[PDB]
Amino acid sequence: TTKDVIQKGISVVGDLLGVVGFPFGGALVSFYTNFLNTIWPSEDPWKAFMEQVEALMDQKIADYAKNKALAELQGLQNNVEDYVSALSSWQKNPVSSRNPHSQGRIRELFSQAESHFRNSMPSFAISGYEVLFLTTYAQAANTHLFLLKDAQIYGEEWGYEKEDIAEFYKRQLKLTQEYTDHCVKWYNVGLDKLRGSSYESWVNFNRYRREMTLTVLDLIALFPLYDVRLYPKEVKTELTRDVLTDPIVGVNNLRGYGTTFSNIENYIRKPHLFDYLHRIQFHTRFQPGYYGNDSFNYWSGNYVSTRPSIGSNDIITSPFYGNKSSEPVQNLEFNGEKVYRAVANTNLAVWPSAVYSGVTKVEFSQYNDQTDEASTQTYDSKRNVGAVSWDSIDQLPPETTDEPLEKGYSHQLNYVMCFLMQGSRGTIPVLTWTHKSVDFFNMIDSKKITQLPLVKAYKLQSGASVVAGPRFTGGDIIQCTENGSAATIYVTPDVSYSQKYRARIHYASTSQITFTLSLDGAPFNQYYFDKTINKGDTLTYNSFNLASFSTPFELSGNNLQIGVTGLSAGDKVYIDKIEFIPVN
């Protein structure tokens, strides 16, 4: 269920990934048309976003609050549509038909929409309904900010006063912070409200966490890239966060046997450097049926192997998960394959006073971007397979239903982990996924501003570690507690010639610090950076600073090392991303 809103959520983020930073006019208009068809066609999507959280929370919005929200939204739709048609005409029409009279038409259309947004926002955040309005607020907030940046692109062409464009920009800055912070605060409120002790508690908890990531968290991660002044070129970026699909189970009610909340949540993958699915070792066991004829084999346990980020080749192999095989082991290898789908079969045996159920078959859809070919790999228990009951596509829809799945998919398989039920009753598999936007090669684009998340590093040092992200950066971050090296990340230059770059860093620090950059062990850039937080502060939007290094440089190597100094006992530095700006 709710796949509709999930698809819309996924698609918008996927489309925005193409118009982030300073977009070219044609691209901006194209975006806007899909945007209007997806998010702003009628009241249906908005109604579905409210129902979505109501379902996750098992609570309802007071009818009056629901109706007012929908009323505001009808009005905002007209404002957006009227605006887009005018913008579309403006781009299309030559720099001749631009008379003072048409300029005033577009200026007032724009002023109306922007103003209507600021006025309406509070309606999506009424006291007591903050969490339930989250996806609605997130989508409305996004529209407001995306709309705002247009004033910095076309402001002068439209004949706006210098004062007007500037007023819009300050307003954009303030709202980027507020909207981001509002979303994280209420996101967390909702998350804590769902923490329980039962297996059923964890499924709900995790479903909320995944759905809020796809519709809210992924979106707010893009907000900063709408600043066309800081990002005067197109931006190459990616989302590095993990999402866990619902557990694969044969029965709807496990009658108390489900793995406890703590035995799941405390054991899922913790903040780690980015990696990719390399190999899976399937363990099978025999489940006897009370009458023999109803027996079946099932997936009892597993081993998983991942390969690190580019720059390192040593394979990481997981501890054993679940139960050892009673049957012959099955191994599937994925080196250079992207698993974009997983479809599973389950089966059950009804005993006089017990029910036994397990995953009997798993078909993986893979795509090889090198040899531009899709294919499948499957796990088969070999005995009494039953029927398909679980499809990843229901939880992780494609970015586009236009192209074939091997092209339009939104996520790939990263991890597999088997949990044991209570009372030796069976196995529960849990799958972890990563976003499609992740570039394996860590490629530095010669025409765009490239954002490199630090989690893409292949080596941490001097006691640097991966820490849970503040929920608004699209992934995790690096924590530095000691003076010295911190991370080594492998970089792939896209051009052969001596292209020069400027580097920018997105960080948070308890003290004034010095960042040093080295290529293949040789220092090339060193600079001074401001303190952004006090010891013990929690990380919100304003905790981070984006600062440039003075001198330009060439990519005369691949191994980028970031070093930190100037820390005192108790000081902490958090690194989110390193950016590259193509310069002449």
From Swiss-Prot:
<dbReference type="InterPro" id="IPR036716">
    <property type="entry name" value="Pest_crys_N_sf"/>
</dbReference>
<dbReference type="InterPro" id="IPR005639">
    <property type="entry name" value="Pest_crys_dom_I"/>
</dbReference>
<dbReference type="GO" id="GO:0030435">
    <property type="term" value="P:sporulation resulting in formation of a cellular spore"/>
</dbReference>
<dbReference type="Pfam" id="PF03944">
    <property type="entry name" value="Endotoxin_C"/>
</dbReference>
<dbReference type="InterPro" id="IPR036399">
    <property type="entry name" value="Pest_cryst_cen_dom_sf"/>
</dbReference>
<dbReference type="InterPro" id="IPR038979">
    <property type="entry name" value="Pest_crys"/>
</dbReference>
<dbReference type="InterPro" id="IPR008979">
    <property type="entry name" value="Galactose-bd-like_sf"/>
</dbReference>
<dbReference type="Pfam" id="PF00555">
    <property type="entry name" value="Endotoxin_M"/>
</dbReference>
<dbReference type="InterPro" id="IPR001178">
    <property type="entry name" value="Pest_cryst_dom_II"/>
</dbReference>
<protein>
    <recommendedName>
        <fullName>Pesticidal crystal protein Cry3Aa</fullName>
    </recommendedName>
</protein>
<keyword id="KW-0308">Genetically modified food</keyword>
<keyword id="KW-0843">Virulence</keyword>
<dbReference type="GO" id="GO:0001907">
    <property type="term" value="P:symbiont-mediated killing of host cell"/>
</dbReference>
<dbReference type="GO" id="GO:0090729">
    <property type="term" value="F:toxin activity"/>
</dbReference>
<keyword id="KW-0749">Sporulation</keyword>
<dbReference type="Pfam" id="PF03945">
    <property type="entry name" value="Endotoxin_N"/>
</dbReference>
<comment type="similarity">
    <text>Belongs to the delta endotoxin family.</text>
</comment>
<dbReference type="GO" id="GO:0005102">
    <property type="term" value="F:signaling receptor binding"/>
</dbReference>
<dbReference type="InterPro" id="IPR005638">
    <property type="entry name" value="Pest_crys_dom-III"/>
</dbReference>
<comment type="function">
    <text>Promotes colloidosmotic lysis by binding to the midgut epithelial cells of Coleoptera.</text>
</comment>
<keyword id="KW-0800">Toxin</keyword>
